[PDB]
Structure 1
């Protein structure tokens, strides 16, 4: 809506086109991470971690 146009024009926010869908700890839970496991599809390249 127009007011964000005005705001970005004032402050020059690029406003990139991508969301934040990360995994986070459920509220209240508090612990230690003991291991991590990664499963990749056959065609996809493997990351450094994997």
Structure 2
């Protein structure tokens, strides 16, 4: 919308077109992680994380 365009022109920030679909913790859940599990296919590399 022209309002957001004017706001971006005023602030002059980059604001790259990148979605924010990260996983969050549900509300009211305060705990501790025991262990994480990363499962990928044979084509994609482990990427130094797994």
State TM-score, norm by structure 1.
0.87
What runs of 5+ residues in structure 2 fail to find an aligned partner?
A: none
Runs of 4+ in 1 over 2 A off after TM superposition: none
What runs of 5+ residues in structure 1 fail to find an aligned partner?
A: none
Residue 4 of structure 1: how far off its partner (Å): 1.1
Aligned length: 50
Residue 45 of structure 1: how far off its partner (Å): 1.2
**2-side partners of 1:25 and 1:31: how far apart?**
10
Higher relative contact order (CA closer than 8 Å, sequence separation 6+) = 2
Provide, for residues 1-50 of structure 1, a one-character-per-residue CA deviation record: whole Å limited to 9, x for no partner.
11111111111021101111111111001101110111011101112220
